[PDB]
């Protein structure tokens, strides 16, 4: 246990028997956020559970030596699962021929991409990602249909456009079930 100077960090770290090979480590910050890490026979990270201030966790399990592993993000009402690589993390939601990918870079840059394998020029879905607004805009038949704003509060919000795609209408609703995300990609 090593507490930082500003009395804000509680680094619950445990050594195996001597002080060379790490085993487990938990660091709790002031803003209710923790980063649990587990290690292997070598000393490279095996699991990495990171908790944000709002309670949404980003859990990494089964980290291999090459830098890969299993990825899953737990949220209020639904979870997003995927894979981590030494490049970036991808979280995948699939509905029919449409696959939605959420990308989290090693620098924290969140990216969202969409792909539809249908070859029809009408029903195929395409998306454009806005970095500043953090909204994925789904386009169908060269007209905008839905807006997918990914809030900094770790939630997915959908706002629908009009019949011509000129502007969004009504109010933007929040997603509380995984089936809702699948319904948006149909």
């Amino acid at each position, epitope marked *: 246990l090593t507490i930082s100077d500003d009395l804000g960090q509680t680094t619950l770290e445990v050594f195996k028997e001597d002080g060379k090979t790490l085993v487990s480590k938990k660091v709790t910050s002031k803003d209710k956020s923790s980063t649990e890490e587990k290690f292997n026979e070598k000393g490279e990270v095996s699991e990495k559970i990171i908790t944000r201030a709002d*309670g*949404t*966790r980003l859990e990494y399990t089964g980290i291999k030596s090459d830098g890969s592993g299993k990825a*899953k993000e*737990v*949220l*209020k*009402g*639904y*979870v997003l*699962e995927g894979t981590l690589t030494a490049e970036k993390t991808t979280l995948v939601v699939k509905e029919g021929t449409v696959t939605l990918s959420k990308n989290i870079s090693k620098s924290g840059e969140v990216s969202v991409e969409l792909n539809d394998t249908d070859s029809s020029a009408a029903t195929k879905k395409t998306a454009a990602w806005n970095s500043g607004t953090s909204t994925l805009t789904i386009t169908v038949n060269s007209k905008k249909t839905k807006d997918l704003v990914f809030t900094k509060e770790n939630t997915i919000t959908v706002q629908q456009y009009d019949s011509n795609g000129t502007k969004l209408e009504g109010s933007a*609703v929040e997603i*509380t*079930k*995984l*089936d*809702e995300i*699948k*319904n948006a990609l149909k």
Partner: antibody, heavy 122, light 109 residues
Framework: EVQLVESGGGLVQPGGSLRLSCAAS????????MDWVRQAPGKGLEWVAN????????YYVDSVEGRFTISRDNAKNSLFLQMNSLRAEDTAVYYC???????????????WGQGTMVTVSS | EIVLTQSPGTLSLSPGERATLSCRAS???????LAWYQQKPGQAPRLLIS???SRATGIPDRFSGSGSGTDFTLTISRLEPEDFAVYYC?????????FGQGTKLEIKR
């Protein structure tokens, strides 16, 4: 204490209609999804309908579509299932059930009620 | 639509034995969207396990869920006379939320 009370079932003729009611107490009704589950005599469980917290989103099985409607009243802490154009195969004990998956922890159907036995026959 | 198959049909065990209940899925079900339920006759079903690991606030340690992907298992370590109900495997990821056909745990005498 968390519990659910079901009412509205009975014996009706084929092609008739009846309304189910589920009274909720002991928990925040506005914060949970809700579901309808039926079970035919001597058969397994079959999910029927699902509703969002605010009632905007409703999902149904292929069989009951266009005939059953699920609604709720957050203020009255109640929930309903209108069942029009009843067929004989709809004879089952309909269990009102709380979703449970209302937060970060993933939970299955937390709460089940006693159920109401609806019988569709001539 | 995901279809869940439960094996065996009925399992005849004596109290105090260990019961292994397996549930097969037609596709790959995420480990975060599977549940186990118990229904004693004449009563409503009760939620036993969620997330394949969580015991749902009041179930003893005898009941234990495991498995991933296609095959999921629920094991009762030391059977008790009140444990010989019908058990159901359910997924709640994508609609329709389907249940298994059910396994009747019967006391073997």
């Amino acid at each position: 204490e968390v519990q659910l009370v079901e009412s509205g079932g009975g014996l009706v003729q084929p092609g008739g209609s009846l309304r189910l009611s589920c009274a909720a107490s002991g928990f925040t009704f506005r914060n949970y999804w809700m579901d309808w589950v039926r079970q035919a005599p001597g058969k397994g469980l079959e999910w029927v309908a699902n509703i969002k917290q605010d009632g905007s989103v409703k999902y149904y099985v292929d069989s009951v579509e266009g005939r059953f409607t699920i609604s709720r009243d957050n203020a009255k802490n109640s929930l309903f299932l209108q069942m029009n154009s009843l067929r004989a195969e709809d004879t089952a004990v309909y269990y009102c059930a709380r979703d449970g998956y209302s937060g970060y922890d993933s939970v299955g159907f937390d709460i089940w009620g006693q159920g109401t036995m609806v019988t569709v026959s001539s | 639509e995901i279809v869940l198959t439960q094996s065996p049909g009925t399992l005849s065990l004596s109290p105090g034995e260990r019961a292994t209940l397996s549930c097969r899925a037609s596709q790959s079900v995420s480990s975060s969207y599977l549940a186990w339920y118990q229904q004693k006759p004449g009563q409503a079903p009760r939620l036993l396990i969620s997330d394949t690991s969580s015991r749902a606030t009041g179930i003893p340690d005898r009941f234990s869920g495991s498995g991933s992907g296609t095959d999921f298992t629920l094991t009762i370590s030391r059977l008790e006379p009140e444990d010989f109900a019908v058990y159901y495997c359910q997924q709640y990821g994508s609609s329709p939320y389907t249940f298994g056909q059910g396994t009747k745990l019967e006391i073997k005498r």
